Amino acid sequence: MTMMDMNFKYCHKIMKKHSKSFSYAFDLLPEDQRKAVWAIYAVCRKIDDSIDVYGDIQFLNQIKEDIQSIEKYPYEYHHFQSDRRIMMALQHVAQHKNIAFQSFYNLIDTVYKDQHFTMFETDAELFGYCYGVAGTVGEVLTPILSDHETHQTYDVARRLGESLQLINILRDVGEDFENERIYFSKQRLKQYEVDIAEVYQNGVNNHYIDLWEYYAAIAEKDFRDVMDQIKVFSIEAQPIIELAARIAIEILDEVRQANYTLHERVFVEKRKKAKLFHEINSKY
């Protein structure tokens, strides 16, 4: 192992321990792309953690400054302030791919702002947040998942990330509620007559199913459009991106099968993921 190998292996360790769902898919990719994805995943997880868990603006400030050092001087040796091994790997990636640094900065700002979770007033603000935490990630991942760095490729990758964020929301509403988080907008909860705490206590009702399915329909339409444009991605990523769309839809059906429960985390079995992947890439 070279030292750089050890940096990527560390990034992999972070992905493998925490990623119950992304990890299976992304490790189906070829080696250079897989490694780049590990470094991006590790950096984004550290960003998300810094606030949610380790509890400091300064660690987040350190991450931003490290990324800024890489952008300004991609070939200089930096004494990274945040996590050395992760930043060395990201710098290696940036020497080989066009990283959309402003997307990292948008992500960091969104994570900062989320510190004080004010509920979203409008779907526009919810979707603005889906962009900030996940559209941005799709943007970062674009030059890794594709050889085309056109408007269309970034737009598809952004939409894929934001829709994945919406699936995540739809799966985790109970868990999120326990953590003092509601992502459905106040405008939409008000329209559908849903109080999450009330539902958490008294079971799923029809007003809630309707609200949930309103947002699920948005997610499903967005995935169909991503699938329509699968070919903007590289030939090796296409099957993996298709699996992601598919698992996303499978999660929506599991929630539905579990009658929209707020009291367990539905998940797609690893064996079933393999079944879905097999089905998919026989077409390739």
Ligand X SMILES: C=C(CC[C@]12O[C@H](C(=O)O)[C@@](O)(C(=O)O)[C@](C(=O)O)(O1)[C@H](OC(=O)/C=C/[C@@H](C)C[C@@H](C)CC)[C@H]2O)[C@@H](OC(C)=O)[C@H](C)Cc1ccccc1
**Residues in the site for ligand X, rule: CB under 6 A?**
18-22, 25, 37, 40-41, 44-45, 47-48, 107, 133, 137, 164, 167-168, 243-244, 247-248, 251
Residue 145, SS3 per DSSP? helix
Least distance between ligand X and beta carbon 238 (Å): 13
For ligand X, the closer CB: 75 or 172: 172
* Measured torsion, CA atoms of residues 268, 269, 275, 281, in degrees rounded to the nearest 10: 60
Question: Around 75, how many Cα atoms within 13 Å sit in the side-chain half-sphere?
Answer: 1
Least distance between ligand X and beta carbon 230 (Å): 14
Residues 155 and 147: their CA atoms lie apart, in Å, by: 14
Least distance between ligand X and beta carbon 182 (Å): 16
Return the structure tokens found at 214.
């309103």
Least distance between ligand X and beta carbon 59 (Å): 15
For ligand X, the closer CB: 5 or 52: 52
Long-range contacts of 160-163 (CB under 8 A, 24+ apart): 160/223, 160/226, 160/241, 160/244, 160/245, 161/134, 161/135, 161/136, 161/137, 162/127, 162/130, 162/131, 162/134, 162/135, 162/138, 162/222, 163/219, 163/222, 163/223, 163/226, 163/248
Q: Which residue has the tokens 């309707």?
A: 210
For ligand X, the closer CB: 133 or 199: 133
* Contact (Cβ atoms closer than 8 angstroms) between residue 20 and residue 5: no
Least distance between ligand X and beta carbon 88 (Å): 17
Least distance between ligand X and beta carbon 95 (Å): 19
For ligand X, the closer CB: 28 or 192: 28
Which burial class, exposed, middle or buried, applies to 264 when counting CB atoms under 10 A from its CB (0-12, 13-18, 19+)?
exposed
For ligand X, the closer CB: 139 or 211: 139
For ligand X, the closer CB: 205 or 261: 261
